[PDB]
Amino acid sequence: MEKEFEQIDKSGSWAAIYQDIRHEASDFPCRVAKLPKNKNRNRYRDVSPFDHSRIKLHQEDNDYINASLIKMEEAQRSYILTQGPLPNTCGHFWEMVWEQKSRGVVMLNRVMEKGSLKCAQYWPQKEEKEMIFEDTNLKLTLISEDIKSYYTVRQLELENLTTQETREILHFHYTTWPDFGVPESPASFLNFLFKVRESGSLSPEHGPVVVHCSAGIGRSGTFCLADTCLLLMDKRKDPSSVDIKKVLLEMRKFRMGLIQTADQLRFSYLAVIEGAKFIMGDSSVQDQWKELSHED
Ligand SMILES: CN1CCOc2cc(S(=O)(=O)N[C@@H](Cc3ccc([C@@H]4CC(=O)NS4(=O)=O)cc3)c3nc4ccccc4[nH]3)ccc21
Ligand SMILES: [Ca+2]
Numbered sequence: 001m002e003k004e005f006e007q008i009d010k011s012g013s014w015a016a017i018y019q020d021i022r023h024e025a026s027d028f029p030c031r032v033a034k035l036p037k038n039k040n041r042n043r044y045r046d047v048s049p050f051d052h053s054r055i056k057l058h059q060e061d062n063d064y065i066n067a068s069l070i071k072m073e074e075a076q077r078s079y080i081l082t083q084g085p086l087p088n089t090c091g092h093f094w095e096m097v098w099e100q101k102s103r104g105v106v107m108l109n110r111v112m113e114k115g116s117l118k119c120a121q122y123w124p125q126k127e128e129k130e131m132i133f134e135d136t137n138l139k140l141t142l143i144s145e146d147i148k149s150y151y152t153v154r155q156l157e158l159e160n161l162t163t164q165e166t167r168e169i170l171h172f173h174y175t176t177w178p179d180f181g182v183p184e185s186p187a188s189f190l191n192f193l194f195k196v197r198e199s200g201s202l203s204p205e206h207g208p209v210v211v212h213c214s215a216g217i218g219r220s221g222t223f224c225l226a227d228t229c230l231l232l233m234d235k236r237k238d239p240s241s242v243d244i245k246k247v248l249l250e251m252r253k254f255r256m257g258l259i260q261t262a263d264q265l266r267f268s269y270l271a272v273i274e275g276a277k278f279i280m281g282d283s284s285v286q287d288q289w290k291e292l293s294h295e296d
Contacts, residue, residue: 001242002273008266018262021245025252028052038064041092043083047215053254055080057092058099065092066216068255069208070224072247075231078208079224081255083216084109084119091133093122094140097169097210098160104170104201106211108177108219118179118214123156123171137161143168148295150176150184151192153199172196177219180260182267186274187292189267193227193275194286202227221258225251226271233272234279244269 008014032038033048041064042048049055049068056063066089067082080100084107085093097105109118124131124142131140143155154171174192176184183189196202201209213219229247233239248265251258259265277285 001240001244001269001276005266005269005273014262014266017245018259018265021248021252021259021265024249025256026050026249027256028253030256032064033066035064037062041086041089042066043086044215047083047217047257049255055082055096055100057095059095065089065096067096067210068216070251070254072228072231072250075228075235076204077202077228077231079227080208080210081216081220081224081258082210082212084111084212084214085122087120090120090122090131091136091138093210094133094138094158095136098138098158098167100210101207102169102210103167103203103206104172104196104199104209106196106209106220106223107171107173108211108213108223109179110175113179113214119212123154132161150174150188150293150295151195153195170199170201172199172201174219177213179214180218180264182222182263183271185292186267186271187289189223189226189271190275190278191286191289191293191295193223193230193271194278194289197227215257217255217257218260218264221248221251221255221260222264222268222271225259225268226275229268229272230275230279233276239276239279242272244272 028050030048032051053068055067057065067080071078111119111121127142139159141157143157145154152173156169157166158169159166211220225248229242229244232242
């Protein structure tokens with residue numbers, strides 16, 4: 001993988017490699033997403049979930065949400081990638097989390113970036129001001145939060161008002177990942193990814209983790225690609241056989257446009273090459289990543 005990395009860097013062909021992936025990516029219909037009645041349920045007109053992999057809400061009225069199930073068979077992990085909830089789809093968002101039995105939510109964007117809203121404030125910012133989603137009959141409360149320099153982890157209590165049942169949801173919010181950009185370093189990214197892994201949120205005993213950014217494809221795709229490749233390197237007899245370009249094409253069978261720039265693709269290689277050191281037994285990199293990330 002790093003041999004390929006070196007060659008691409010030397011040739012300066014990242015844009016070409018990336019364009020080839022865009023050209024070869026699957027193109028499946030998004031008929032439901034495009035129905036007139038779903039116009040206000042989509043944040044961006046050019047980012048829709050494929051019908052075959054879309055997550056269906058459990059309701060007779062309208063079961064649509066701009067979200068896709070990415071099921072990576074070999075890696076044995078599923079992720080739900082979705083757009084940043086809109087003011088009218090926050091209830092749908094949490095209904096999906098409840099129905100799919102998700103334990104964690106990974107947010108890679110900020111509500112406002114460079115003066116523009118990119119996502120609705122779908123969770124409570126104050127413990128004393130909980131939220132009620134009347135359309136889906138759910139209540140959400142901020143229990144606590146651990147604020148680090150570039151990411152915050154929150155403990156949320158989600159309650160199904162119909163049954164009084166409650167569940168703890170972990171919110172992993174990466175706050176310094178610019179739009180169409182990359183994390184400050186492979187170290188800061190990996191430190192965060194392993195925080196999510198360590199929480200148990202990605203365990204197969206839970207429903208798929210919900211990952212989102214603004215459109216749910218650029219930053220969200222980078223996060224999932226790196227995680228899946230690391231999973232495969234740890235599982236295969238020979239980790240050097242992991243073809244990140246092939247893994248990305250496989251993921252794009254489930255949702256369009258995953259990885260939005262050639263540099264996010266290059267960053268994925270770097271994150272996986274760096275992350276591989278831990279997978280192969282290096283006991284000092286995890287700690288090194290934390291120091292490098294300056295999370296305190
Ligand atoms: C072609 N063209 C020129 C540029 O501006 C737009 C914006 C939209 S639009 O209706 O505002 N649609 C947006 C969709 C969109 C929005 C945000 C992102 C973010 C990129 C990232 O790193 N993470 S993400 O939150 O997925 C990815 C994709 C979108 N589509 C684009 C196509 C080319 C370049 C930038 C784009 N942003 C549609 C077309 C165009
Ligand atoms: Ca207070």
